[PDB]
Amino acid sequence: SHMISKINGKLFADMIIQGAQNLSNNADLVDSLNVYPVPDGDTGTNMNLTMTSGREEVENNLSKNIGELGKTFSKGLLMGARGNSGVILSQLFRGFCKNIESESEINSKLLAESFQAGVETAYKAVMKPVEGTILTVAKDAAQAAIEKANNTEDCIELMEYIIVKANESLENTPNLLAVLKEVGVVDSGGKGLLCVYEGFLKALKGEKVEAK
Numbered sequence: 001s002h003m004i005s006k007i008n009g010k011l012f013a014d015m016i017i018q019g020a021q022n023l024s025n026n027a028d029l030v031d032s033l034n035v036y037p038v039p040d041g042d043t044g045t046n047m048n049l050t051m052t053s054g055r056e057e058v059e060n061n062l063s064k065n066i067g068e069l070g071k072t073f074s075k076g077l078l079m080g081a082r083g084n085s086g087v088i089l090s091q092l093f094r095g096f097c098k099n100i101e102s103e104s105e106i107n108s109k110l111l112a113e114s115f116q117a118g119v120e121t122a123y124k125a126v127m128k129p130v131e132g133t134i135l136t137v138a139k140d141a142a143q144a145a146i147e148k149a150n151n152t153e154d155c156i157e158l159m160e161y162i163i164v165k166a167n168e169s170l171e172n173t174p175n176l177l178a179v180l181k182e183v184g185v186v187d188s189g190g191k192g193l194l195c196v197y198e199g200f201l202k203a204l205k206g207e208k209v210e211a212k
């Protein structure tokens, strides 16, 4: 009754919009977690402003064609990327959207492959990648996506599993990055990414994030 076998451009737009709203609602929390590389209190603000730049382009130029919608989202992120986290987020989504540029809709396997493509783009963009960060969480989420999509057609079930595994990775970040364990926090960039992913899931279920 509620399975998602294909994601068109409007469903992707909904994922973007609900992910952006969920991040906005949690931006102050994500800011306060920020300790790496400097505790300058801005991860949530940076990611929120970057995501908002993408969301605004999407809201003004919707399409049934997921590839075209992805081009619109990607351009918005890339012209408004703020801070280390916003730049990395924009590169994750640049690679994700490039992977689907020629599609009108995608299935669960192409969704998983697009997460992986985003990870590859983001790691290549960062000259000195550090583990325990948004890169680690994205990498572990994408590996989970590939494994699960191999026998899961339903994108809701797939995204639920991605979130379980992304949360496990996020909770493991202090075991990779010393300052996180010393201060007693998880990685702020990774937390912001989880906020986006949890909005993706709401949209796949046809639900909306309540605006704080």
Ligand SMILES: Nc1ncnc2c1ncn2[C@@H]1O[C@H](COP(=O)(O)OP(=O)(O)O)[C@@H](O)[C@H]1O
Residues within 6 Å of the ligand: 034, 035, 036, 037, 038, 040, 042, 043, 044, 046, 047, 082, 083, 084, 085, 086, 088, 126, 128, 129, 130, 131, 132, 133, 134, 135, 187, 188, 189, 190
């Ligand atoms: N070298 C790096 N490798 C991977 N992720 C990084 C790196 N540097 C920063 N990050 C990510 O960026 C987050 C901090 O984002 P942000 O506060 O926007 O950065 P800044 O304020 O230093 O520009 C970190 O929690 C981490 O997820």
Ligand SMILES: [Mg+2]
Residues within 6 Å of the ligand: 040, 042, 083
């Ligand atoms: Mg900063």
Ligand SMILES: [Mg+2]
Residues within 6 Å of the ligand: 034, 036, 037, 038, 039, 040, 041, 042, 043, 083
């Ligand atoms: Mg910061």
